[PDB]
Amino acid sequence: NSFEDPCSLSVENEKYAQHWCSQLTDADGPFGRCHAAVKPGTYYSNCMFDTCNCERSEDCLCAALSSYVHACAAKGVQLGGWRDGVCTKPMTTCPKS
Amino acid sequence: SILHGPTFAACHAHVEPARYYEACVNDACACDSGGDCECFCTAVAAYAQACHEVGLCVSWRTPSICPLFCDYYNPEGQCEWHYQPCGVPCLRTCRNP
Amino acid sequence: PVVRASNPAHNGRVCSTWGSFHYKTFDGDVFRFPGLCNYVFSEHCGAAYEDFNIQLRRS
């Protein structure tokens, strides 16, 4: 294990990750209804690290957000409508019917 | 960054420096009312004590990084007091003859 | 620590890029790399804390 900080290696990656992963910790954002059931700090850290690290930043950001959404759903909290903005591509691309 | 460099390289396999580094950075950011060097010294000494407790006595204090004025305790004409990372659990005193 | 200096030729401390993707390293190796992406020109990776990190991009 090394003490790497990928977000410090790129300005634009840091800006993108901070802009899109901070919605997890926003009290009034799409994920604000779940801050009581599930604590979003670990998911925010995972989102930042994955977005700054992997080449397909949007895929890792969407994976982290979906992981938080699934953890919320395991607690009985529904967060529908969270894909507005980013992570909307999976909504449209799926089988015809 | 001292908590991630060669100074504590031997301890990195026995004490995880993640939370200690985070506390160091947060305290140094928040120690804005005066005496940030005390905040930094306390934050690094926490990790140093954690390292020393598990048998690893690293020498991290330098005249520019949290110096210790041991010579202050030397009586006039004497030179006895030395810095010990491990400490001396059974130095000879007259309370433990 | 006293460090003396007498030789004024300091080409070993200079790295540069010029012309048609021509690169000269600090050690004197001149090569060509026609990359148009974002690359790390030079960064201080030899310490726990990084003093500098310079990146360049071509179009």
From Swiss-Prot, chain B:
Protein localization: Secreted
Post-translational note: C-, O- and N-glycosylated. O-glycosylated on the second and last Thr of the Thr-/Ser-rich tandem repeats TTPSPVPTTSTTSA. One form of glycosylation is also known as Lewis B (LeB) blood group antigen, a tetrasaccharide consisting of N-acetylglucosamine having a fucosyl residue attached. It has a role as an epitope and antigen and functions as a receptor for H.pylori binding and facilitates infection. C-mannosylation in the Cys-rich subdomains may be required for proper folding of these regions and for export from the endoplasmic reticulum during biosynthesis. Proteolytic cleavage in the C-terminal is initiated early in the secretory pathway and does not involve a serine protease. The extent of cleavage is increased in the acidic parts of the secretory pathway. Cleavage generates a reactive group which could link the protein to a primary amide.
Induction details: By IL4.
Tissue expression from the record: Highly expressed in surface mucosal cells of respiratory tract and stomach epithelia. Overexpressed in a number of carcinomas. Also expressed in Barrett's esophagus epithelium and in the proximal duodenum.
Subunit structure and binding partners: Homomultimer; disulfide-linked. The N- and C-terminus mediate their assembly into higher order structures to form filaments. The CTCK domains of two polypeptides associate in the endoplasmic reticulum to generate intermolecularly disulfide-bonded dimers. These dimers progress to the Golgi apparatus, which is a more acidic environment than the endoplasmic reticulum. Under acidic conditions, the N-termini form non-covalent intermolecular interactions that juxtapose assemblies from different CTCK-linked dimers to produce long, disulfide-linked polymers that remain highly compact until secretion.
Function recorded in the entry: Gel-forming glycoprotein of gastric and respiratory tract epithelia that protects the mucosa from infection and chemical damage by binding to inhaled microorganisms and particles that are subsequently removed by the mucociliary system. Interacts with H.pylori in the gastric epithelium, Barrett's esophagus as well as in gastric metaplasia of the duodenum (GMD).
Domain remarks in the Swiss-Prot or TrEMBL record: The cysteine residues in the Cys-rich subdomain repeats are not involved in disulfide bonding.
Name this protein carries in UniProt: Mucin-5AC
Protein source organism: Homo sapiens
From Swiss-Prot, chain C:
Induction (free text): By IL4.
Residue intervals passing through the bilayer: none
Cellular location(s): Secreted
Domain notes: The cysteine residues in the Cys-rich subdomain repeats are not involved in disulfide bonding.
Role played: Gel-forming glycoprotein of gastric and respiratory tract epithelia that protects the mucosa from infection and chemical damage by binding to inhaled microorganisms and particles that are subsequently removed by the mucociliary system. Interacts with H.pylori in the gastric epithelium, Barrett's esophagus as well as in gastric metaplasia of the duodenum (GMD).
Subunit structure: Homomultimer; disulfide-linked. The N- and C-terminus mediate their assembly into higher order structures to form filaments. The CTCK domains of two polypeptides associate in the endoplasmic reticulum to generate intermolecularly disulfide-bonded dimers. These dimers progress to the Golgi apparatus, which is a more acidic environment than the endoplasmic reticulum. Under acidic conditions, the N-termini form non-covalent intermolecular interactions that juxtapose assemblies from different CTCK-linked dimers to produce long, disulfide-linked polymers that remain highly compact until secretion.
Name this polypeptide is given: Mucin-5AC
Organism: Homo sapiens
